[PDB]
Amino acid sequence: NNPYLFRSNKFLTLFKNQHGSLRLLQRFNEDTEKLENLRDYRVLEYCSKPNTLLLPHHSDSDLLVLVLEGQAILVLVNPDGRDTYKLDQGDAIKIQAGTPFYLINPDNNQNLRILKFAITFRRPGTVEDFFLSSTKRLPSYLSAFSKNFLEASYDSPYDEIEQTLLQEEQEGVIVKMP
Amino acid sequence: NNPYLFRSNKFLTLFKNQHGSLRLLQRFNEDTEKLENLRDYRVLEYCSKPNTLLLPHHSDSDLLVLVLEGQAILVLVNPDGRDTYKLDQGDAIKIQAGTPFYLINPDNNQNLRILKFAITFRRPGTVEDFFLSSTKRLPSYLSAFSKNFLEASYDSPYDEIEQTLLQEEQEGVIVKMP
Amino acid sequence: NNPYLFRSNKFLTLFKNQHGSLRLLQRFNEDTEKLENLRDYRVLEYCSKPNTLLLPHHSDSDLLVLVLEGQAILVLVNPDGRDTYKLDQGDAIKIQAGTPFYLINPDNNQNLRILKFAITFRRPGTVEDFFLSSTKRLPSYLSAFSKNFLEASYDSPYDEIEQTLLQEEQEGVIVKMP
Amino acid sequence: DKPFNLRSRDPIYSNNYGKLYEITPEKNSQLRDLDILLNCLQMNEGALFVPHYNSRATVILVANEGRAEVELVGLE
Amino acid sequence: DKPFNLRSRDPIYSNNYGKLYEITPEKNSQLRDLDILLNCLQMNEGALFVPHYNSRATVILVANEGRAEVELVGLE
Amino acid sequence: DKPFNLRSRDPIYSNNYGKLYEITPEKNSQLRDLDILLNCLQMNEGALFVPHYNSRATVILVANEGRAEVELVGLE
Amino acid sequence: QLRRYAATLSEGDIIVIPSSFPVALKAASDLNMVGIGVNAENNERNFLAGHKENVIRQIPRQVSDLTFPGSGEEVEELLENQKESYFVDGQP
Amino acid sequence: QLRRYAATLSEGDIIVIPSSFPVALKAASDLNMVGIGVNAENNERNFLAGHKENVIRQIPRQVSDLTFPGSGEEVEELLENQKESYFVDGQP
Amino acid sequence: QLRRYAATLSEGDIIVIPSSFPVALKAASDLNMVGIGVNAENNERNFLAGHKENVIRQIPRQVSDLTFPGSGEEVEELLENQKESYFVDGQP
């Protein structure tokens, strides 16, 4: 058939709850040797419904974010402050690899569709997301740190950290806005 | 034997009529792992006799053109004009990937030898040529377009396009100058 | 176990006499596919004792030289002069690929430990050293040149070149300073 | 740092049958650091994007709204 | 052309429990041409380098003097 | 945009036994964008190009006119 | 060998267009697409049909008589029976 | 899947730390290390614990109540029981 | 291991010379060659023989006595029995 065509059913499901979804396009150089020049790029599609927010996480790649439909509140978090952006349909924004961010869908009527073009470099063609929160998918990466290490870092009793940071709250990375 | 040596018999024949020839050097990293840093480069050699012209085509790579012997009329075609160049022995010229061009050998006495150094990027190590004309090698790429599509594009009866553009004229990509 | 850890026993011995040693860290992308972005880098460790000098040689890669312990006399040789540098603990210096150089350990008390970070490009992930001197490891590369060629180059009788340049002097690339 | 809209500029092409918007690296610094090009295609029903080709860029085309009959010519 | 010392500048971090020196490409031309970053870590016994991460750089850490308990978190 | 001749400049080397012409990226913008180097070697019969090496460039040598005895030293 | 890759994409579908490959597409219905082009520096489009930016149209009369079967003026004429550019019709 | 790579390096040992991977290390004894970071342009460190440069600390109160199990103020409080930064203690 | 790759190229033949590898070639007849060097930025040639640009010649007298078997002055002398540079003779 055709090596340059990619139907919507070539997108793998990263996560998908009754609130939204995150899809990942397979590697362009997967089934054909004719797209070797596209091996470092990945396309993802973020889909969510009204009053939902993609939880806090940073990725290991740069992300060209593109709002295909709806409006959004993209909040980029810096170590010395946070930057708020009202993303409107047709707007694009690059998210520096490693910048933690959360996306919010404020409208109560229409859904939100976003295209994230991924530019990989640490491990070409692979994109990873580190969610600071813990769920059924996976638990806050802060939880992998040894008992003693977490106590000295945050200077608090273990059960208290496991109490405030580490335990599972919501069931997915996309939650409904209270 | 030796992995850095490439005899003239390591050049493959792209095309060769009683008017000239186009040779392509095999991939430097073909038989040895010691030239991996040269994998994106290809060397070609264009050879033609007096009063001949390499037909109109564009390539997918940048080309460093080098006139090893003779003189030539390199004509580079832009979408808003054309640029004529009188190539003289010892002159070099880069031909931007995608610029359509034709090479002419004006002298009636001596032959023409040219070296094209290819810098690939779309598909590393591979070089392709799209000839707008149709021959025994292959027919104008415009001919691959569906019937209806070609009629709407050029706004003319099909048989008329197949009449003016699509049918085979000469037998090779190198023709004698009238 | 762990693909990001490299114990000191993962360094291969290039050379090691009773005067010093040159160690080479295995390729980062050797046993794991997770460090493909580090494939062009090599880490080496140069260790020598008091009053010793690494003989004259140039490498095919750029070298970030780092003095982890001790002091050193790095002498970089140009085709139109030589540049002397007194390397002190904590100092770094890039050695342009192809610059011939010798390292000297002047102190009579403490040893010398150096880290050379290699940035390869001719043959990614591989680092080579061309020592102008001849030993038991290997004989001056000048010696590979055919008899006649060496005579015309240096304009002298063969036995005289084989006498002054080509014959083996010391037993290793690291010698004691007289 | 601020984001940008794909329609903040006049269409490169804006016929009667269609419109193509394009933001190139020479015009924007965010795309410059990535060497990426973005364009927004808009076409009426029955309209045709005449045969052409791009000299250096490889375009990843995403169908957002509607169906499109595309014809691609390559050389294998 | 002259060489440079890893401690020629003030520590980026210089606590009571430790110090980290860092020379970045934006500050030095030799490292700029290689796109390399160098830093010198200094820590007292019992001290802890709190969990953090680097946004773009992959650091090759060389233990020069002493032992260190390092904890690395990745996602496989 | 205009083309250029490999002999438009004075030879880098111009002995009695031979001549080598060289056009480097620092001198020409077309070659700069490709990071390519071009040189034209000219030698009388019996002449010898003394042993040397290039620090960064890998030269693809094309024999145009005549025969040449070349000796290459590598390390395997 | 030459090859034609034809197909209709629907919402969500994607098609990669390699540089230098000729391409054309008709709108089955009101279309809205997005292209993310890589390696875009100094990129430029070249049209094979249409009034503006048509290359087949810059090929000199002399040489065009040898590149195509048509007779010198026949090609020039053909290449202009279309006054519209970039985007056209599709009704036979 | 999540994974923890723990280990003590001694003189001469090396550990590569991939960008974006969280990392922490305790000094068993007086430590002196060297890091050679590649692809360093526009690099920046982000701390998850500590007073200065702690990101968990910039997450707005509202959203933090939905990102962590804690109750809005509980996380803010927790993240500040440490007045020291970058480098800490290790005595329970 | 060390290796010698010797050969005579005729019209049309090509030889790739990897950077840093020492090289030399004699003209069997009137020669005219072309080299297309890649990764040329800040490239520089270094000669091992000859008067000008000979590196073996910049090695200080002291250290040269330990790098080569010769006796300090013997090497300096040897390296100068050639007043010509870059290109030489070939008649024994």
From Swiss-Prot, chains A, B, C:
Domain Cupin type-1, chain residue ranges per copy: 4-162
Swiss-Prot/TrEMBL keywords: Seed storage protein, Signal, Storage protein
GO annotation, cellular component aspect: protein-containing complex
GO MF annotation list: identical protein binding; nutrient reservoir activity
Family note: Belongs to the 7S seed storage protein family.
Quaternary assembly: Homotrimer.
Function of the molecule: Seed storage protein.
Record's protein name: Canavalin
From Swiss-Prot, chains D, E, F:
Superkingdom of this protein's organism: Eukaryota
Similarity field: Belongs to the 7S seed storage protein family.
Name the UniProt record assigns to this protein: Canavalin
Sections of the chain in a coiled coil: none
Job of this protein: Seed storage protein.
Subunit-structure text: Homotrimer.
